[PDB]
Design a protein around this nucleic acid. Structure first.
Lengths: 185, 35, 99, 50, 141, 181
RNA sequence: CCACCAGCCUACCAAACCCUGUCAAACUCCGAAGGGUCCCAGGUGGAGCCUGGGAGUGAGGGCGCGAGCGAUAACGUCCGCGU
RNA sequence: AGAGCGCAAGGGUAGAAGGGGGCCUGACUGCGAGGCCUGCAAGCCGAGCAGGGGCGAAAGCCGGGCCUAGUGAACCGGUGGU
RNA sequence: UCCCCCGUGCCCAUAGCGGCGUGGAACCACCCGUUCCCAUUCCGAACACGGAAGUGAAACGCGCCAGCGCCGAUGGUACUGGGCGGGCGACCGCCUGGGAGAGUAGGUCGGUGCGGGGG
């Protein structure tokens, strides 16, 4: 959705940050300049739209331009967000990480077993004109001891792939019990 | 196949088990045997 | 496949690059430092004689005398595939003193 | 080292010298090899003394 | 009680630890996360004591996953021998963990299971720590 | 280019057959023959020495060539001779020696084999080769009992233009090569 | 499971690789601040060069900051830079 | 270039040093500008000079081996030559 | 004078790879015959000699999916010659000068010196 923005100049990080803002550096193919936004609404809004969806940041320079983030670079010590980078919107064969929602209640589950998800945001491609929001996929007939993955996922028509694709998406695993302390021996 | 020490060649035949007339050229002198 | 810088042996301190292939001899005098050559002479691309053995010989010498009007002294034989077969051009009579 | 030893040579035809070492174990009988006699031009040299 | 296996050498020097962690601060594996937080060593006793608290209270639950690995030669010396000779031997197989270094993640439980487990677990360690969820550590390889 | 039985046979028939079946608009790309290897690993030259080389020389002496022995690589702890230098003969067959050898082989070294049904087809490279080894060396025509010590079998090897099993095996059918099929 | 040979299996042991992730004073694809020093220029100062004449001095130690036997113990502590 | 390169490690090298062979024998005599190091002693490299060799047809290569331990000032005596 | 292929040096993997196109008269790979050369721990596969038959496929230069590969800033931290400050410890923070790798967009299947074969 919509967020603020401001053109950045030759100012240094800490200032913008420790004040109550956060700097960025947008680009797209033929672009690479520097920008920034405000903190509180950044933090808040990133919970919702995020890299899950598309951002439409408003520049006071006029153009309320829609882009996408990516690269965010934490401070790693007493940490939190500390420098988002921005790719800009196009229509070319672009790639990103689509969020997911695995739905249902299968057979490994219920008995006590537990799913091991290996991906929620996934490596795929599309044209930004498309809006393949967040893919909600299959978890009906699952069983412990087996795995599902690869090119076995649903496609909102058009969306091509970008992996190998035998990348393991998930697998159901046998839980942990204090009878593994019988192994403690 | 040149050199100086080579196990020789030269004409050889085949006398099968059926009264044959076949023409060959091999390393050992003469040969005749089977089908 | 005769890398080995056989040319390092030829990176001694003077060169002379040539070649032989199908029906043609490719003989050229090269000075180096930048890789600036100098002299030229071929087998059939010269409308010389029509036999590889003989031609070869004198073609070397041909180029040699030409080089004598251009000013040289000593160099090194440059080639990758050879076994070295004299080719009594052997660019030796061919000015160079060669061998 | 010893039991592997070390040796020298004289000039065949009345003396001229040089200094190296030796080797045992191997079937290495006598040993003469080309060198230069200090006096006179290129001769061989033979194994004398120790 | 796991470790490597007498790799290359067996005695290695002490250490002073300012702050960097080298990284390794996110989910990727499962879900709910326990995050270590001080400049110190992770004790094997506390490794499987955390594992205790876990499968202890939460039994017949789900699956828990690891990113860490305790391996350090505690150069210990014999007692009353008077100081000097030698360095010492590889006891206290601790690991090297600084502030902000996360480490433990649970999956397949209720929110509160994680919560309580992480409470008592934190009550055990030779220091203390924090805990959180899944939303803003997406993209970290 | 001295022509024999299977030589001329190979020549004519294989050309239109091969290219009408597989298609090849080239004198030099149409799949043909290449090389053959006679191979003899017998690491008994731990001791025994070159009395065994007498035995080994006999092998290619009767095929008509002067063979080059090949040593071992490294330590065969179980089978002595570590550093690797016993007796592992091999001799290479060019275009025309291939003719005589293949001819004999296909005529005398096969219709014999006591339980002869054919040669295993799945003994293929997939990269257009066919390696095959055999038990008794004494089945050859130019050898008679009084010369041999025991069984000096050999893993014969052949390379071809062939890039798959198809072409080479069909070729073999043309040039009279037994097969388990 | 078959002796004409092989069809087959794997709540197992499990090479590799994969991807989720990471540990390294004696590992390094990378690589700092730099440091060392070389030529031009600055730099008259209990500067710098040579000689020789006479010397004392050859456990230093505080504190910082950095590696170590030390237990992130000692006003133990041997080097390092710094004083 | 993870083989290997004599023994350990590091470096490094198949544009060899490794691996196959022919002829040989510079594992040279008397000097060496020059310097690294360096209290001293010591260790070390070295193109070029006159002698005069070996191979490569030559341009040229060799004043022992790819390198860093295999080495021990002095006093005293044996040894042949001069 | 704008200009087609090869002996061949330099740029350091954008030059390398699977593949995709490639030419042949001339160049080249060859082809061809072991008479010449000398060569193979065996084999003319390595190299010479000689051609009418004769190939453009396997080989090179040259034109490409750019999947792999390598090239990779922009911004920020990680620390830090230098200076000034708080600790049960362990640690830290502000200035000065710095600026990685990583994340990222992104880029290339070749850039080029001489000499000789020419529309």
């Amino acid at each position: 959705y919509r967020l603020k923005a401001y053109y950045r100049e030759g100012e240094k990080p800490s200032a913008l940050r420790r004040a109550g803002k956060l700097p960025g550096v947008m680009y797209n193919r033929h672009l690479n300049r520097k920008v920034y936004v405000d903190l509180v609404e950044f933090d808040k809004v990133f919970r919702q739209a995020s890299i899950h969806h598309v951002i439409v940041l408003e520049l006071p320079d006029g153009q309320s331009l829609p882009t996408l983030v990516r690269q965010v670079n934490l401070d790693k010590r007493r940490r939190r967000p500390e420098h988002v980078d921005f790719f800009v919107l196009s229509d070319e064969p672009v790639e990103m990480y689509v969020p997911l929602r695995f739905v249902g209640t299968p057979a490994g589950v219920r008995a006590g077993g537990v799913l091991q998800e290996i991906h929620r945001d996934i490596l795929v491609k599309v044209s930004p004109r498309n809006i393949p929001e967040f893919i909600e996929v299959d978890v009906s007939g699952l069983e412990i001891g087996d795995s599902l993955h690869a090119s076995d996922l649903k496609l909102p028509p058009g969306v091509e792939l970008a992996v190998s694709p035998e990348e393991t998406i998930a697998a159901v695993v046998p839980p942990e019990d204090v009878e593994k302390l019988a192994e403690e021996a | 196949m040149k050199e100086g020490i080579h196990p020789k060649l030269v004409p050889a035949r085949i006398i099968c088990g059926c009264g044959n007339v076949i023409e060959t050229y091999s390393t050992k002198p003469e040969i005749y045997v089977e089908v | 496949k005769f890398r080995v810088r056989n040319r390092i042996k030829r990176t001694g301190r003077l060169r002379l690059s040539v070649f032989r292939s199908l029906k043609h001899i490719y003989a050229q005098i090269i000075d180096d430092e930048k890789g600036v050559t100098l002299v030229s002479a071929s087998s059939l691309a010269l409308k010389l004689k029509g036999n590889k053995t003989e031609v070869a010989r004198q073609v070397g010498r041909a180029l040699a005398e030409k080089a004598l009007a251009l000013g040289i002294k000593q160099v090194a034989f440059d080639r990758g595939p050879y076994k070295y077969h004299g080719r009594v051009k052997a660019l030796a009579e061919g000015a160079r003193e060669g061998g | 080292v010893r039991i592997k030893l070390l040796l020298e040579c004289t000039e065949c035809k009345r003396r001229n010298y040089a200094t190296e070492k030796n080797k045992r174990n191997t079937p290495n009988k006598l040993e003469l090899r080309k060198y230069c006699p200090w006096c006179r031009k290129h001769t061989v040299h033979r194994e004398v003394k120790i | 009680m796991l470790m490597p296996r007498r790799m290359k050498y067996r005695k290695q020097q002490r250490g002073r630890l300012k702050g960097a962690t080298k990284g390794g601060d996110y989910v990727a594996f499962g879900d709910y996360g326990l995050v270590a937080l001080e400049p110190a060593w992770i004790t094997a006793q506390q490794i499987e004591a955390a594992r205790v608290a876990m499968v202890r209270h939460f039994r017949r639950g789900g699956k828990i996953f690891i990113r860490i690995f305790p391996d350090k030669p505690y150069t210990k010396k014999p007692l009353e021998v008077r100081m000097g000779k030698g360095k010492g031997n590889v006891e206290g197989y601790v690991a090297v963990v600084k502030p902000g270094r996360v480490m433990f993640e649970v999956a397949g439980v209720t929110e509160e299971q994680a919560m309580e487990a992480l409470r008592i677990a934190g009550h055990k360690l030779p220091i203390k720590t924090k805990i959180v969820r899944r939303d803003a550590y997406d993209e970290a390889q | 280019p001295l022509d024999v039985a299977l030589k001329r046979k190979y020549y004519e028939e294989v050309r239109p057959e091969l290219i009408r079946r597989f298609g090849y608009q080239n004198v030099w790309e149409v799949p043909r023959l290449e090389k053959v290897v006679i191979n003899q690993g017998l690491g008994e030259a731990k001791e025994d020495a070159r009395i065994l080389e007498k035995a080994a020389q006999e092998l290619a002496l009767i095929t008509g060539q002067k063979p080059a022995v090949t040593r071992a690589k490294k330590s065969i702890s179980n089978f002595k001779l570590r550093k690797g230098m016993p007796i592992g003969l091999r001799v290479t067959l060019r275009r025309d020696r291939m003719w005589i050898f293949l001819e004999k082989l296909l005529n005398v070294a096969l219709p014999r084999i006591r339980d002869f049904r054919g040669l295993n087809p799945n003994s293929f490279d997939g990269r257009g080769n066919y390696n095959l080894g055999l038990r008794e060396q004494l089945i050859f025509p130019e050898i008679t009992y009084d010369m041999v010590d025991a069984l000096r079998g050999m893993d014969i090897a052949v390379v071809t233009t062939a890039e798959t099993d198809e072409e080479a095996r069909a070729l073999l059918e043309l040039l009279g090569f037994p097969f388990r099929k």
